[PDB]
Design a protein around this ligand. Structure first.
Ligand SMILES: [Mn+2]
Ligand SMILES: [Mn+2]
Lengths: 288, 288
C-alpha cells in the first residue's frame, strides 16, 4: 500500500495551489497527496503539466477526491442536471488522464453536501445513479481512472451508507472501473462491523480513507487500527490509504466539516506537521 | 440505574398515543418509557392525569425527550424567539410536573435538527444559551425536573459536541437542576474517549441514552458496553439508561434521524419487540 494525506488538512478553504502541498507531503514522508477536483476544470493545458511535473519530481503520486455540486448530481430526477453531471465528469476524467491521476473517489454517484430540505426518493435516484455511473465508467476506462464510490454516513449521503449497499450498487453498475471506497470516519457511524465491511468490499475495494472517529490524525482516537489492517491484508488490498483529518476551526473548511471546537489547543503548523508525520508513521506500522 | 426505551422506536412521528407504549414497555421488561414532548402542551388536564395513572398502574417511570423547533431556540439572536422559547419550556415543565415526569433531555439549549444554512455564531449563541438555560433552571427547580443538556455530534448540533464542553456549560449555569446528558451514538462520533467522557461528566451526568453506532438496539454493534458500564459505576451514576434505537425508514423520524435503509429487512413489530426485550436484558447485564 501507498499512504497519503488530503490537502485540506492544512487549508481553511476548499481551494489552494497544490504544488506547495505536494512538496509538503514529500518532506513529511507521504507517498500520496490527495487533491480536490474543483479547480481542475479551469486549468490551462500547461497548468496540468505543471502539477504532473512537480508531483513526479517529488516522488509523490496524486489522487483525487470530489464532492459533487447539486448541479453535478448523476442521480437527479431532472434530465438537464444528469446531462450536465455527465458533462462535468467526462471533462474531469480526461483532465485526470492528462495529469496522470488514476483514482477519483467521493460521493461521485450523488452530491455533497446533500440538501435534506428536499423530499428523498432513494429508489428513484438509485436507479438513475447506477445508469449514470455506468456511462461514466466507460469514460473512466478510456482515461485509465478508477471511479471509486465513497460510502458516507447518513448525514452526508443517502444512497450508499454501508459497504453492503456499495457492493449491490457496483454489481449493478457492472464495470471493472467502478470500485468501492471506504472511510474509517464514515464506517465508524454506519457499519455493523469494521473488519466485516472491508471484507464485504473485497476485490471491489479501490480506495481507502483514514481518520479517527472525530477526524483527528490516525492514532489519536478509537479507530480499530489492528482490525482494519488485518481485514485489508485478508482481501489483499494494494491501493492507497489516504488520511483525511480535519482539526482546524474556521473558514469554509471548518464550517463545511462542522468543526465547532479547537481540536489542538493553540498549536502551530509545526505541531500539525509533526502530528501528520507521526500519524503516517503509525498508519504504515498498523496496516503494512 | 433504571432502564428505558424511547417510544419512537416503533413510531414514525415525533408524537403518538403513549398509553399503549407504557403497557408495551412494561410487558417487555422495561422500567422506563421515554416520550416526546411535542404533544404535551396540548394535553387536557384529564389527559395528563390519565397517563400518569397509567404509568403508575404499570410500574413504568416516564421520562421526556425534546428536540426544539427553531421557534424554541434559547440561543437565538432574536429576542422574540428567546421569549417564546422560555414561555414554551415554562409551560412544558409545569405539564411534566402534572404528569410526574422528573427528567427532560435533548438539545434543549439549542434547536434540533440544526439547519446550517445560516452563519453559525457559536460564541454569541453560547452566551445567550447559558443565560436562557440558567433562567429555565429556576423553573425546572420549581416543577421538580432535571434539565439535561444532550451532547450531540456535529451534524445535529454545534454548541455542545463533547462532554468537556457540556461541563464548562453547566458549570457556567451553576444550578443543580441543569445536568449533562450523554448518548452512546453521539459520543461514538465526537469523543476522544468513551469512558473518559463519562468520568468527565461525573457528578453532572443526569441522563443517559444508549444505542449502537448506527442506532441498532444495544448489543447489535460496536458500542464499548463494558467500558461504559465501568465508567458509569465508577462515577456513581444512578439515573436512567434509555435506549433510543432507530431501525425503520419513513416520516419525520426517518427524515430527522436520516434513516436511509431498513436496518432489519422486513421485520414486523413483534420482531422489534423481541429485539428490545433482548437488548434491555443485555443492557442491564452489561451496565448494572
Ligand atoms: Mn472521506
Ligand atoms: Mn439521544
Amino acid at each position: 500500500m501507498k499512504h497519503g494525506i488530503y490537502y485540506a488538512y492544512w487549508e481553511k478553504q476548499w481551494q489552494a495551489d497544490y504544488i506547495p502541498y505536494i512538496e509538503k507531503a514529500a518532506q513529511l514522508g507521504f507517498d500520496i497527496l490527495e487533491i480536490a477536483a474543483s479547480p481542475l476544470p479551469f486549468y490551462s493545458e500547461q497548468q496540468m503539466k505543471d502539477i504532473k511535473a512537480c508531483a513526479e519530481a517529488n516522488g509523490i503520486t496524486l489522487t483525487c477526491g470530489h464532492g459533487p455540486s447539486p448541479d453535478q448530481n448523476l442521480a437527479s430526477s431532472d434530465p438537464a442536471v444528469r446531462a450536465h453531471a455527465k458533462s462535468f465528469f467526462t471533462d474531469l476524467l480526461s483532465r485526470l488522464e492528462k495529469m496522470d491521476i488514476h483514482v477519483i473517489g467521493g460521493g461521485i454517484y450523488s452530491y455533497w453536501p446533500v440538501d435534506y430540505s428536499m423530499p428523498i426518493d432513494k429508489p428513484g435516484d438509485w436507479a438513475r445513479s447506477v445508469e449514470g455511473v455506468a456511462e461514466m465508467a466507460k469514460v473512466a476506462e478510456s482515461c485509465g481512472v478508477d471511479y471509486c464510490l465513497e460510502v458516507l454516513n447518513r448525514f452526508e449521503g443517502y444512497l450508499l451508507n454501508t459497504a453492503e449497499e456499495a457492493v449491490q450498487f457496483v454489481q449493478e453498475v457492472n464495470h471493472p472501473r467502478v470500485k468501492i471506497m471506504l472511510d474509517t470516519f464514515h464506517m465508524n457511524i454506519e457499519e455493523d462491523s469494521i473488519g466485516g465491511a472491508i471484507r464485504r468490499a473485497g476485490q471491489h475495494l479501490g480506495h481507502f480513507h483514514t481518520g479517527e472517529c472525530n477526524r483527528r490524525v490516525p492514532g489519536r482516537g478509537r479507530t480499530p487500527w489492528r482490525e482494519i489492517g488485518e481485514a485489508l491484508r485478508d482481501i489483499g488490498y494494494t491501493g492507497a490509504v489516504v488520511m483525511e483529518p480535519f482539526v482546524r476551526m474556521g473558514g469554509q473548511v471548518g464550517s463545511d466539516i462542522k468543526i465547532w471546537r479547537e481540536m489542538n489547543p493553540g498549536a502551530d503548523d509545526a505541531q500539525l506537521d509533526l502530528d501528520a508525520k507521526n500519524a503516517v508513521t503509525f498508519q504504515r506500522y498498523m496496516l503494512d
